[PDB]
A = this chain, B = another copy of it.
């Protein structure tokens, strides 16, 4: 018997990300000798991006390739299954945490309670911010209407005085064009260019060279499958799909990074100015961020479990000092 799964991605059609996702479906067919095929759908083709969770839960979709933290408002732990401000900031650190420090099992247990099978994380990129007006220091965030992906990311910017809004990446261009928002984070340079941000915002705001991505340094995607659908798939094919997703994680990461190298010169040609914040701006954000990490960790049992092991790992690699954790504990 052969299996066919409908899977929608958070990537919009006409982006480098969707092209990579389409190629993944061909790779899955190849690795399973046609026994398991994935029918790809670009963002919004079946349901809205933020509605994918419920669509997969019910079976309208068989699976999804979202940015994991989109479920932060309903599953606290998902804010810890993708990067948060000023924490672990390299792809390899998130890979180690998931694959040898216990992160994958925490994600699987949390998603199983929701009737979903979390396959694994998909590496991707850091994220940048586009702004219509210059934001040159920490204090310039006050009063900025900023699109962000909710959760802990939005909470940190709200603590910096911004008015945050949640919108799918495909709605950012018209929101900026119409002046509904002043600035927007979405993903890295290449996809944001595919979406036209350079024509509706003349600035890019990044951290200093020492900390280029303050809010989302490792913006992970994942594959999450309807649990019944997953359990119905023969084990040999389940294992081949897990391996296919892990291989794709890095093929996707590499494809996005190649496109990003090609994108920076295009921003220069479009007259977009890249503004770099300072090391002191980062210290200000850090004092806002750390207590917010603990607030989120304290929401439920899974968020606490995930943050506890990430905090131990950060201490082990010198990312956090005991002094800056004064008054904060699990």
Contacts and interface: CB of A to CB of B under 8 A. Distances in A.
Contact of A96 (B90, B236, B246, B258): B258
Contact residues of A: prevailing secondary structure: helix
A45 interface: no
Contacts of A250: 95, 99, 246, 249-250
Interface in A309-330: 313, 316-318
A233 interface: no
A236 B33 contact: yes
Interface stretch (A65-73, A193-201, A237-245): A237-245
Given A243-B244, A246-B246, A250-B250, A257 B96 contact: yes
Nearest to A101: B258
A313 B100 CA distance: 30
A316 B31 contact: no
A247 interface: yes
A257 B253 CA distance: 21
B30 A239 contact: yes
Contact of A254 (B90, B100, B247, B317): B100
Contact of A261 (B90, B251, B261, B316): B316
Interface in A90-105: 90-92, 95-96, 98-101
Contacts of A30: 236, 239
A245 to B, nearest CB: 9
A143 interface: no
Contacts of A264: 316
A329 to B, nearest CB: 21
A257 B33 contact: no
A48 interface: no
Contact of A240 (B91, B95, B240, B313): B240
A254 B123 CA distance: 14
Contacts of A33: 236
A184 B218 CA distance: 35
A115 interface: no
Contacts of A255: 99-100
Contacts of A90: 90-92
A236 B34 CA distance: 11
A315 to B, nearest CB: 10
A240 B92 contact: no
A19 to B, nearest CB: 12
Contacts of A251: 99-100
5 contacts: A30-B239, A96-B253, A240-B240, A247-B247, A249-B250
Interface of A: 30-31, 33, 90-92, 95-96, 98-101, 123, 209, 236, 239-240, 243-244, 246-247, 249-251, 253-255, 257-258, 261, 264, 313, 316-318
Given A31-B239, A92-B253, A98-B254, 20 more contacts: A30-B239, A90-B90, A90-B92, A92-B92, A92-B123, A92-B257, A95-B253, A95-B254, A96-B254, A96-B257, A96-B258, A99-B251, A100-B251, A100-B254, A100-B255, A100-B258, A240-B240, A246-B247, A249-B250, A250-B250
